[PDB]
Design a protein around this ligand. Structure first.
Ligand SMILES: OC[C@@H](O)[C@@H](O)[C@H](O)[C@@H](O)CO
Length: 100
């Protein structure tokens, strides 16, 4: 509502407990104050447990590392901007599974 989604979200695995998430600026709305990276464990494709929100509270932000993940575990990741007119649209989920 406050903005379109972050564009070209990418996930790069780092190790069995961490992945690197990056994105491009939403299409130029409210003014961007930061980004909300949300991830949730999936079990057989279904979300399980509370989603975890990692705030990246720089308007210039375009990346963050999610760490403390469990090995051999599947996660669904979305990104949304925080704006002066409320949350932006969330990106479509990107789903990855950590190595062993
Ligand atoms: O489709 C993959 C499967 O559901 C698995 O990766 C779970 O996320 C993991 O077993 C968590 O216990």
């Amino acid at each position: 509502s406050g903005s379109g989604p972050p564009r070209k979200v990418e996930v790069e695995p780092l190790n069995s407990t961490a992945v690197h998430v990056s994105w491009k600026l939403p299409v130029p709305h409210g003014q961007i104050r930061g980004y909300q990276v949300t991830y949730v464990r999936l079990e057989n494709g279904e979300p399980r447990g509370q989603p975890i929100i990692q705030d990246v509270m720089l308007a210039e932000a375009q990346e963050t590392t999610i760490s403390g993940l469990t090995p051999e575990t599947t996660y669904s990741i979305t990104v949304a901007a925080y704006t002066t007119k409320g949350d932006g649209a969330r990106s479509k989920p990107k789903v990855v599974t950590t190595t062993g």
